[PDB]
Amino acid sequence: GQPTDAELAEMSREELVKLGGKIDGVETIFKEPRWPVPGTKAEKRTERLVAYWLMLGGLSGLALLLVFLFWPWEYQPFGSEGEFLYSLATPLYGLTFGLSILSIGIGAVLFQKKFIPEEISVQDRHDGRSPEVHRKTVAANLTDALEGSTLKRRKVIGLSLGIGLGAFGAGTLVAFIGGLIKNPWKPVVPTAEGKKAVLWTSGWTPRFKGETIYLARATGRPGESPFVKMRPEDIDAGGMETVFPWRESDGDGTTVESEHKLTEIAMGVRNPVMLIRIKPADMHRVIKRKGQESFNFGELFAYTKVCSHLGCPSSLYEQQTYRILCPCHQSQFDALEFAKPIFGPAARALAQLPITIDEDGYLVANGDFVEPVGPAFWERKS
Amino acid sequence: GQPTDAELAEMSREELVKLGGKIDGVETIFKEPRWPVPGTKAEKRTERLVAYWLMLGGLSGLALLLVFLFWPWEYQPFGSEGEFLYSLATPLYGLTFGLSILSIGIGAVLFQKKFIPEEISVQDRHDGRSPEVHRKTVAANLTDALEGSTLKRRKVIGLSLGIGLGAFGAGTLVAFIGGLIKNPWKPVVPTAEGKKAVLWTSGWTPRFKGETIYLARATGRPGESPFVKMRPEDIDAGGMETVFPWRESDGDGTTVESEHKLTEIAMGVRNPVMLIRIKPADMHRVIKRKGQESFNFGELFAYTKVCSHLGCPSSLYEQQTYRILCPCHQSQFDALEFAKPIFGPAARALAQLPITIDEDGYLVANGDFVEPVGPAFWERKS
Amino acid sequence: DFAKLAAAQGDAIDSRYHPSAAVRRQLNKVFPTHWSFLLGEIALYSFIILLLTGVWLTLFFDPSMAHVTYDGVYQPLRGVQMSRAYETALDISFEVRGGLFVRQVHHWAALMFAASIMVHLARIFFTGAFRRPREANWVIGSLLLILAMFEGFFGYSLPDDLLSGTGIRAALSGITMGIPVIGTWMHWALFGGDFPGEILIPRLYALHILLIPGIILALIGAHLALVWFQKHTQFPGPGRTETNVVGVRVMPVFAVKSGAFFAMITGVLGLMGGLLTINPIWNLGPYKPSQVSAGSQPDFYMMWTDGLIRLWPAWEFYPFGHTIPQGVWVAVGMGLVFALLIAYPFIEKKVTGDDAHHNLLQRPRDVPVRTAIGSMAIALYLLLTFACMNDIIALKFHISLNATTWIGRIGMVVLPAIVYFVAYRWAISLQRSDREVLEHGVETGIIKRLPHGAYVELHQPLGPVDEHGHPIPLEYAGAPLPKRMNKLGSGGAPGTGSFLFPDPAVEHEALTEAAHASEHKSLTALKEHQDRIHG
Amino acid sequence: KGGALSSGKYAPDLGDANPAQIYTAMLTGPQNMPKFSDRQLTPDEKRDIVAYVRESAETPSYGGYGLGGFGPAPEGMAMWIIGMVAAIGVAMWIGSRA
Ligand SMILES: CC(C)=CCC/C(C)=C/CC/C(C)=C\CC/C(C)=C/CC/C(C)=C/CC/C(C)=C/CC/C(C)=C\CC/C(C)=C/CC/C(C)=C/CC1=C(C)C(=O)c2ccccc2C1=O
Ligand SMILES: CCCCCCCCCCCCCCCC(=O)O[C@H](COC(=O)CCCCCCC[C@@H](C)CCCCCCCCC)COP(=O)(O)O[C@H]1[C@H](O)[C@H](O)[C@H](O)[C@@H](O)[C@@H]1O
Ligand SMILES: CCCCCCCCCCCCCCCC(=O)O[C@H](COC(=O)CCCCCCC[C@@H](C)CCCCCCCCC)COP(=O)(O)O[C@H]1[C@H](O)[C@H](O)[C@H](O)[C@@H](O)[C@@H]1O
Ligand SMILES: CCCCCCCCCCCCCCCC(=O)O[C@H](COC(=O)CCCCCCC[C@@H](C)CCCCCCCCC)COP(=O)(O)O[C@H]1[C@H](O)[C@H](O)[C@H](O)[C@@H](O)[C@@H]1O
Ligand SMILES: CCCCCCCCCCCCCCCC(=O)O[C@H](COC(=O)CCCCCCC[C@@H](C)CCCCCCCCC)COP(=O)(O)O[C@H]1[C@H](O)[C@H](O)[C@H](O)[C@@H](O)[C@@H]1O
Ligand SMILES: CCCCCCCCCCCCCCCC(=O)O[C@H](COC(=O)CCCCCCC[C@@H](C)CCCCCCCCC)COP(=O)(O)O[C@H]1[C@H](O)[C@H](O)[C@H](O)[C@@H](O)[C@@H]1O
Ligand code: HEM
Ligand code: FES
Ligand code: FES
Structure with a gap:
């Protein structure tokens, strides 16, 4: 009821705590200690119990x-003297780590749940609709500044x-965004028609006219000749095989002008094509689609590996049912008719992808895809 | 003197502003408007003046x-139709940008300095030594929680x-730092003595025994044969020339197993060596130091390019005064005696660096440096 | 020189500043001690771990797409082309001392983060902690969930291990191209090129160290400020009216249990960061766009997204010369659900009519249609997730893969209806189960009636009793009423001695009489405060 | 580890796989797998693949329990009932209920 300036040094300490509650809004009803009887040994045993938890945390x-x-970690490669010790480093x-800080935390909260005195302190709120002074005073101060x-x-x-501020916000906002906005339909990649954009252009497209684009596999060799040229006798009946658009120009990976025309094939998204060799007992089940009747080679089909959507x-392929299954969303495709x-x-x-054999009998692409090969987007299908 | 709850809706707005000052500590002595006489045209002219600044900001x-x-920026390479337009993009x-937001800012502050009413509001502070309630109440509350x-x-x-907490802080602190702490004196690099650490080992050191380490220059060709083997007839009298430790193994830059044993030379710090060809009228001014009397080759000296300290x-070299000058801190070295x-x-x-000529007459290193070549550190000079 | 120097430095702090007012306001603030009010703290307490690990992971990770051969220690990846993001993530895994552990406890802290955000959203949803005073707090917490989800997706895609590289190809580049008008434009703005455009991984590293966690830290700061100053909510109980917060104060009790709960959350994350592998990127490969896994599934907090791809039944449109693909739908659909999850309190403020300042919570049985709409959303999430591991479910639990994605594709249409029915009527029957514990007592063992053969359950009443076999039936008050005399003071006095040896009997009498008197004093003080509120 | 396939069929785990069975598995593809022939993959490459799978399904999971081999779905389900159930159990041991 008053600030109590002179009688505060005489005031006891728990009365100062209740005075702080009263001046803040709280009342600590029922703040009683956990061990009100002293000298008991259940208190001493829970004392050494929380000491056991904190000493386990320190240990x-x-x-x-x-x-x-001091531990024999290192990546010791495989089964050898010192691999099991790295297996549990x-x-x-x-x-x-978890046992240390979990023992320290369970010790601190067991010290809270056994020795820190339990309280139910109720705090009078003042939430919602600030009183008649403060609302109208802030309203008057803001409307005096306006x-x-x-x-x-x-x-x-x-x-x-x-x-x-609007014109500068538009200029600054376009200065934020203008470094990002690239035109996807700027003609970038050289193609046989000229310069086409990137979505209508995989690495399967011809650059000038009919050039030999070999359907080369990726023998996963670390660097030296990763793309080996392909024959139809390699893949056999009921076989998926992944081919890439290698050329006679970008040869082995033994030159620095290669391995960048050559890892470009391995990094470009719309490059991988699976080379299906349908078992020839199942060539009467095939029904081709339009503009695509001669895109086989006998029983060699070349469907792309990048799926229809997303x-x-x-790269999942099922012979004896002939379904190109994708892993990411489990969408089957019919290998027989057209995918x-x-x-x-x-x-x-x-x-x-169309297929022919080259002179010397190597599998080559008979041109480009007739449709854009990757996932769908706006500008498509006309 | 009272909260004034009922008489506050009748209270005027500037009286509410002064009430907010009084309830916070402020008094707005002298808050008078800038244009107390209305209808004057100096007010209208400064109105259209700050309008001119803000309209310049918007424009x-x-x-x-x-x-x-809409601007012809692109890096148009050099002197050509469209290079001066990129020169001021x-x-x-x-x-x-600066004219826009600077005109908006000078408009806003000229609106402050011409139309926003000037005030000298004095705010009574309450700084330093919180009153007798709050200090002892927080002290009692913290000592009640302790x-x-x-x-x-x-x-x-x-x-x-x-x-x-101390043992876990030590374990967690060493878990922070333990990924960083590498031993610099773990033997890493293969050397003729065996495996030496990195500071005692440039690329000038022999790997097994006396091998031909050619003092090859860097013809700055983009990739194809960047290091050309060197003869003494190339450098002439009074000439700095920068040599690198090329070998017969890591050949031209036309293979991917090269250009990584070959850019390793161009990226290693302690590799560059200047090849001084002292004019032979100034060979009587030279005085060699210990263990180093035969490290010339006639008048070919090979001093390193990485300096003494830091x-x-x-790579600055002065003939006719014979001083290897460094650029970063301008420390001369005497090219005549020893640097x-x-x-x-x-x-x-x-x-x-010691010099001999190879069979077929090419400049090679006659071993390693006798001292660690880079900047100084602790473990040195014994 | 330990308390005198504390007093001297305290008077120095009170001399320089004047903090003690606005410190006493802080360490007398009351937080209620209900257990669910710790749940969102996990979303805080793991997030600090995500900085304390994550900063450590910044000073070893090198983002790039410059193709490097490995030439390190890990033997099944030697001489293989890899992006330098993957190469230095392999270096975090295998070179640095305790590196695989810090990156694993970082990924597990990310999982506990994005899972405790969902647990805490379930808390503040079903308990009704989002209406009138705290609806902006719901909005910034919902945006914080969105940023958590997208930022973690930028996280495990930040090394381009191909299990998550195909996650970028599915989610961040198939859905982004699959947006009708400005889809390809925002794709080629996000990547700067094609899908392995050379400035994707550093842009994700830029958005993922600072740019999204800066917004996450700003929203957590403003969020805990909204929880702090605007007082915390509470369940209604004995002495719990609309305009007070009962519980423990910050300084003696809540700070100790909050720091200890931070330490135990860090203990759970450390134990499961050591004992359990996560994202084994060396078992995975470098991202090359011609090779996949079979799983190819994202992290679980985003498994509802492309599971929604896995279940949306291939509906594409073809206007005059163009194509709307499937990926538009989920780009609508993720834009749909978030617009229902941000703006829900305004939705049911319009529907119900809750124009009142609510501070007391409502128990999730007391609000059956909102709990049932919520359980629709929970079970729809569980369906879209549990049909995103569609692949490995049909692998292990031997089901046709087509069959389990049809189970999901029908389940997202009929299982919210089933769980709405079960949830609504189950909430009403949970109401009726603790509205018969008031009209009757609390159930116990059976006595027979003496002169005839009957069987009464011998109910123990909770309030005042009348002169006969029925009490005065109490009214409901939003409280959890106890349904076991077990949880009342019945038979709760074991031997106080030890687990093996008893204490002497006078010490047992002193301890049980003192603890009984303290519990009696607790309910006496709380009851007289409750009478002080109304009387 | 295994993977799902189209209509009921599934890839099996490669852990319980004799190396000659792995070579003759890719050499003559039984059910729904392509027969990776003697000319599609050379015997150097096939010996090389069976070198990989007998030291990928045999090497221990470096750095903890291997929650399967495929990552994020077992890591999620072991986040919930191992990590998050323990977290909520700690949170209900610390805080009370009312
Ligand atoms: C509360 C609710 C979401 C209402 C919000 C309002 C609603 C109307 C907004 C619209 C939402 C509708 C239209 C679409 C649904 C989409 C969905 C909500 C996406 C948003 C993300 C987020 C909010 C998800 C919901 C929250 C989440 C499910 C709460 C967790 C469930 C419960 C209540 C917490 C306790 C569970 C805890 C004790 C562990 C128990 C163990 C059980 C088995 C865990 C279940 C489980 C889960 C939940 C996994 O995520 C998971 C992921 C990967 C592998 C396995 C699991 C798994 O077993
Ligand atoms: C976050 C707020 C979102 C607000 C979005 C709306 C604001 C749009 C303002 C931008 C206007 C245009 C800015 C200047 C751009 C311009 O002039 O537009 C030319 C041709 O476009 C056009 O007319 C079409 C313009 C219509 C814009 C379409 C895109 C809108 C949005 C939806 C895209 C999303 C962006 C934000 C999300 C990304 C998230 C990132 C984390 C590009 O031809 P280009 O030949 O590629 O030139 C290249 C240089 O531009 C380029 O910087 C340079 O890098 C060179 O690459 C150069 O090639
Ligand atoms: C600031 C506003 C916000 C919008 C932000 C983005 C808008 C930027 C517009 C700037 C370019 C305007 C036309 C010139 C740019 C240009 O020429 O291309 C267009 C590239 O614009 C696009 O990306 C998107 C729009 C396409 C044009 C019309 C789209 C709007 C209307 C038609 C759709 C609504 C009505 C239809 C149904 C609506 C929904 C459901 C009913 C269309 O692609 P495309 O048609 O495939 O042409 C190919 C050559 O690019 C390439 O060289 C060549 O190789 C060609 O073969 C071909 O591939
Ligand atoms: C910010 C707070 C600063 C506190 C600094 C004082 C705290 C020191 C705690 C660290 C104790 C040692 C941790 C474990 C380390 C250990 O076992 O020490 C071995 C041999 O060292 C030793 O005994 C000497 C230990 C004495 C420490 C000397 C360094 C102290 C300070 C001054 C260095 C500054 C660090 C902070 C500044 C850097 C700023 C960064 C932004 C390393 O042989 P090594 O063969 O290279 O093994 C490599 C794996 O260690 C390695 O992780 C792995 O990456 C492999 O590279 C592996 O080779
Ligand atoms: C936790 C405490 C905080 C300290 C943090 C760092 C201390 C880590 C000590 C761990 C290594 C223990 C020494 C034995 C391991 C070891 O040998 O590594 C030492 C590398 O320790 C150093 O960096 C600095 C100390 C080295 C000797 C002791 C230095 C202090 C004493 C000796 C001087 C103080 C008073 C002197 C004047 C007062 C000055 C006041 C500032 C010495 O190498 P070094 O002596 O140069 O021999 C080379 C082989 O390395 C290499 O293989 C081989 O090629 C050799 O040829 C040679 O190059
Ligand atoms: C205490 C001191 C510190 C020591 C470190 C302790 C940390 C553990 C790491 C230490 C190394 C142990 C990991 C071994 C290495 C390892 O990865 O663990 C494999 C996983 O295997 C299995 O599952 C069988 C294990 C069954 C045991 C119980 C399962 C664990 C449960 C509790 C996990 C809970 C998950 C949540 C349940 C969800 C709730 C649903 C309602 C078991 O290897 P193995 O059995 O021999 O053979 C594999 C073939 O299982 C494998 O099908 C074959 O494909 C190969 O991988 C082969 O190597
Ligand atoms: C906002 C909460 C955050 C979440 C949910 C999150 C999530 C993730 C995830 C899931 C990973 C993948 C870890 C792996 O599997 O290797 C990751 C990686 C990473 N995190 Fe975060 N993160 C967060 C915040 C941060 C912050 C604040 C920093 C740095 C100050 C950071 C630094 C990193 C770095 C550099 C990586 C990549 C290194 C690597 O993955 O090995 N993260 N993050
Ligand atoms: S990602 Fe393969 S079809 Fe959707
Ligand atoms: S001497 Fe060359 S910079 Fe110091």
């Missing part, structure tokens, strides 16, 4: 220091500052 | 939008929580 932190400094790290500063009486500043490689989606979230025919 | 923001969207960007929670009476928790390449610092912040002889 496991010291264990972290020891098994972090990180689990020993995590055991000591009405007294003589805006809303000068029309020309009131609109010219708006036009200024562009994952559909129409049998089932899945796809709705478009996965693209087919 | 220059619109100019930013125009010269950012970024200055036009900055002119429109004395009432029954720490400083339980010795075993009071030390075991300390040992727990490791910048000392002793004539003047500068260096105190150590810049290292000298």
